[PDB]
Amino acid sequence: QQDLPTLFYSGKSNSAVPIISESELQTITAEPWLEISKKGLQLEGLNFDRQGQLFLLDVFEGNIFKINPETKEIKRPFVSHKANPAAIKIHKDGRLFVCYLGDFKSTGGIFAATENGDNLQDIIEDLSTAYCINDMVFDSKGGFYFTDFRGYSTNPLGGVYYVSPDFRTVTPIIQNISVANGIALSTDEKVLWVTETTANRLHRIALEDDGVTIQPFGATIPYYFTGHEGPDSCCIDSDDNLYVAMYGQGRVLVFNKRGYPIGQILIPGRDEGHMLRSTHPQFIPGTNQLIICSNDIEMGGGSMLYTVNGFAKGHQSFQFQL
């Protein structure tokens, strides 16, 4: 697909530190790519495997879907045995890691399994930990950072934690976050991006070489989002731009490597209150074609994946590591 709405490095989108308002951002409207269901499913957790196949899920029913981007064929290999799964991150060894929220209070955690639902492993046990995990991102060593999705605006119970490659140690990276949601590592893995949903803030965290210590005055707030509900999941491209799905806003915002907004992707029907639940953005491996999932549960509609071409090709994350 080459005739898809595309984002270019023109105007202020090509500036290192653009001074601009959201209404002035280079904007494009996403094209419908594939309807998952006529029924309302809370789509989330987009992630491609080493073979370029798309894996995603729906929070409330816990269905795990596998999609052939080429044929548009949709399969449903298995259903999560844990309540409210919210993200899927594929390991370099092929396993699917599934972050779940549980009861939203503390019964969340992370489990791993084959693409067919076999060999269920408790990476982060649910009942023994207070965590309710929404997303995660693997570093090149096999360790990973995850977001603790808890609390609300003035009750910052959330935060970000790092799990060692052997999965035996959990280390706090940054805490006192009002519902940490989205998370991403820069291409050099020295910068961690985190979205705080209930406070509408974007966090940029500069890390030391050990991957756990924050550089002096290294955790900052480069951007204050606006509108109900707030920032959700995010991913980066090979140019270190950050794509942030805005939950309840029917759009995705794109920031350059310095945390400045350079692009905006609208979901068809948002003005009328449709498809406002845009939750996750992800690139088709080896290309700059972006997929975005959203749903019309609020308006009694269905679940749909949308698409556009981003500023650059998707980044080669952990599952694509050789």
For Ca ion, which is the closer residue by CB, 13 or 147?
A: 147
Should residue 233 be labelled a site residue for Ca ion when binding is judged by CB under 5 A? Answer: yes
| Residue 81 three-state SS | coil
Burial 148-187 (b: 16+ CB within 10 A, else e): bbbbeeeebbbbbbbbeeebeeeeebbeebbbbbbbbbbe
Q: What is the C-alpha to C-alpha distance for residues 277 and 295, in angstroms, rounded to an integer?
A: 5
Q: In this structure, are residues 58 and 43 in contact, taking their beta carbons and an 8 Å threshold?
A: yes
For Ca ion, which is the closer residue by CB, 115 or 232?
A: 232
Member of 6, 27, 129, 287 binding Ca ion (CB under 5 A): 129
Member of 108, 159, 230, 231 binding Ca ion (CB under 5 A): 108
Should residue 131 be labelled a site residue for Ca ion when binding is judged by CB under 5 A? Answer: yes
- Cα distances from 220 to residues 190, 216, 228, 279, 296, in angstroms, run 14, 11, 22, 24, 34
For Ca ion, which is the closer residue by CB, 109 or 314?
A: 109
Member of 49, 115, 126, 196 binding Ca ion (CB under 5 A): 126
Which residue from 247, 265, 270 is spatially nearest to 311, judged by alpha carbons? Answer: 265
Minimum distance from residue 273 beta carbon to Ca ion (Å): 21
| Residue 310 three-state SS | coil
For Ca ion, which is the closer residue by CB, 108 or 143?
A: 108
Helix (H) or strand (E) segment spanning residue 33: strand 31-37
For Ca ion, which is the closer residue by CB, 37 or 129?
A: 129
Minimum distance from residue 149 beta carbon to Ca ion (Å): 8
Q: Which stretch binds Ca ion (CB under 5 A): 68-76, 109-117, 151-159, 211-219?
A: 109-117
Which residue from 256, 253, 320 is spatially nearest to 284, judged by alpha carbons? Answer: 320
Which residue from 51, 74, 48 is spatially nearest to 63, judged by alpha carbons? Answer: 74
Minimum distance from residue 145 beta carbon to Ca ion (Å): 14
Should residue 232 be labelled a site residue for Ca ion when binding is judged by CB under 5 A? Answer: yes
Which residue from 256, 250, 259, 254 is spatially nearest to 290, judged by alpha carbons? Answer: 254
Q: Which stretch binds Ca ion (CB under 5 A): 100-108, 138-146, 264-272, 287-295?
A: 100-108
Give the total of residues touching Ca ion (CB under 5 A): 10
Dump strand ranges (E) for 239-302.
Answer: 242-247, 251-255, 261-266, 280-283, 289-295
Minimum distance from residue 95 beta carbon to Ca ion (Å): 20
Residues 164-203 vs Ca ion: string with x where CB under 5 A?
A: -----------------x----------------------
Parallel, antiparallel or unpaired: strands 251-255 and 31-37: unpaired
For Ca ion, which is the closer residue by CB, 26 or 318?
A: 318
Minimum distance from residue 170 beta carbon to Ca ion (Å): 11
Is 240 marked active-site?
Answer: no
> Pick the catalytic residue: 49, 139, 148, 232?
232
Residues annotated as catalytic are 232
